[PDB]
Amino acid sequence: ARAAFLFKTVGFGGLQNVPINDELSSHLLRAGNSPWQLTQFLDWISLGRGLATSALVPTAGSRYYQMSCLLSGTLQIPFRPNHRWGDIRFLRLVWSAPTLDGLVVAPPQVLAQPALQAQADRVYDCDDYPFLARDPRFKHRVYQQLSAVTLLNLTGFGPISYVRVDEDMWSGDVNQLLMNYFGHTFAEIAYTLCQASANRPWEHDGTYARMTQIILSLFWLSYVGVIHQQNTYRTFYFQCNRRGDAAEVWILSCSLNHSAQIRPGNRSLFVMPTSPDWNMDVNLILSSTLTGCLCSGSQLPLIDNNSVPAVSRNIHGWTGRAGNQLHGFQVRRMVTEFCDRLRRDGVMTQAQQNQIEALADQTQQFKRDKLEAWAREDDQYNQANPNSTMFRTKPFTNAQWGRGNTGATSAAIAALI
């Protein structure tokens, strides 16, 4: 039952200002002036042919990161001690009104004076800005994004997701209600749930909070290979079209007479892709968004300080002293872990595995060449115009392309049953 609302803005990638300029920020306001609407963070494609590119927004992760920046700067305006919302500008941007309804061009009087020297890795507590503190509805409406962002800002890697398993959640007709989700794709199930979170505040142990947790659970357990067509969780299991492909498509399917034995108790952990290729994996990135919403209303276990960079330690609602640790993983590698299990349980033939792996390899290469090249395009620009430096995608290091701890977390997840 969450009570502390704080978020962490993004840090500079070695730049001397938030990694975003005018050209970029302006182009982000897709669905309107509100930086809080969903379609500002995720696009909606009828999937399966995926991978959306843009001149300014190369990948889906590119957008997700960019929004994180836009909010990181702008938000520092009303969060100052004087809590003024439109007296100073940030890159020629200014808030529309107290309730932070929308963003717009700074008034001449404002453009006349210097901009706000926004800093990096800041941690703020909503309850400090009056207007947010007085209206729980408003606060809730916004936090959805704020948390979703900090879940991408705690570490220099990808978007953190939350995996939990507890038979006690299935209490009530919760079971019935899920079956209505059979047949839908993960993407669909997530997008809708995320969109509908801001409608109104909900209870931390309500049919919503629970289902969203169960879905996440189901997805991941399947993604890794623990659950499958012949080892279902109460007959539920996400089936992937063709694992490894450029754009994966998972569908919540049903399978009878192969229910697995789940151990009584409550278990949970945090996961996060570490390989740059997450910027091009819509599901992984949605899964986090969803997790974000979960946080907007429920207080999850703290993330162990030792798993995150200095700057983001001891953040009241998120990172704490001794808590659960983060589990990273390379996308490619996990693919095999996935296969191995399926094959071993007799659902996949050795031959099939070989095909999938071969594809997964082909994909990784493709996705990398791109990311790596766009990266240069950026450095090339930054040198060209040092007064408006930026990043169209969260910075990544060659090291990030390794296996580092995949097997480890693979087992860890499997150990939730």
- Binding region for another protein (CB under 8 A): 97-99, 131, 134-135, 172-173, 176-177, 180
Q: Which residues pair with 94 in a beta bridge?
A: 104
Tell me whether residue 394 is exposed, middle or buried, using C-beta atoms within 10 angstroms of its C-beta: 0 to 12, 13 to 18, 19 or more.
buried
- Minimum gap (Å) between residue 128 Cβ and another protein: 15
Tell me whether residue 114 is exposed, middle or buried, using C-beta atoms within 10 angstroms of its C-beta: 0 to 12, 13 to 18, 19 or more.
exposed
Nearer to another protein, 97 or 373 (CB): 97
Helical H runs in 225-330?
Answer: 282-297
Evaluated on CA atoms 205, 211, 216, 222, the torsion sign reads: positive
- Minimum gap (Å) between residue 181 Cβ and another protein: 13
Nearer to another protein, 26 or 99 (CB): 99
Q: Which of 154, 188, 150, 163 is nearest to 292 (CA)?
A: 150
Nearer to another protein, 12 or 143 (CB): 143
- Minimum gap (Å) between residue 109 Cβ and another protein: 14
- Minimum gap (Å) between residue 98 Cβ and another protein: 5
Q: What is the dihedral of CA 214, 215, 221, 225, to 10 degrees?
A: 150
Q: Which of 230, 213, 220 is nearest to 291 (CA)?
A: 213
Q: Rounded to the nearest 5 degrees, what angle is found at the Cα of 204, between the Cα atoms of 203 and 207?
A: 70
Nearer to another protein, 135 or 203 (CB): 135
- C-alpha span between 90 and 248 (Å, rounded): 38
- C-alpha span between 148 and 63 (Å, rounded): 13
- Minimum gap (Å) between residue 228 Cβ and another protein: 29
- Minimum gap (Å) between residue 46 Cβ and another protein: 11
- Minimum gap (Å) between residue 243 Cβ and another protein: 27
Nearer to another protein, 50 or 98 (CB): 98
Nearer to another protein, 173 or 200 (CB): 173
- β-strands 266-273, 326-329: how paired? parallel
Q: Rounded to the nearest 5 degrees, what angle is found at the Cα of 390, between the Cα atoms of 389 and 393?
A: 160
CB-based contact 259:408 (threshold 8 Å): no
Assigned token pair, 338? 């996935």
- Minimum gap (Å) between residue 173 Cβ and another protein: 6
Nearer to another protein, 83 or 344 (CB): 83
Nearer to another protein, 8 or 210 (CB): 210
Nearer to another protein, 22 or 135 (CB): 135
Buried/exposed code over 133-162 (b: 16+ C-beta within 10 A; e: otherwise): eeeeeebbbbbbbbbbbbbbbbbebbbbbb
- Minimum gap (Å) between residue 333 Cβ and another protein: 37
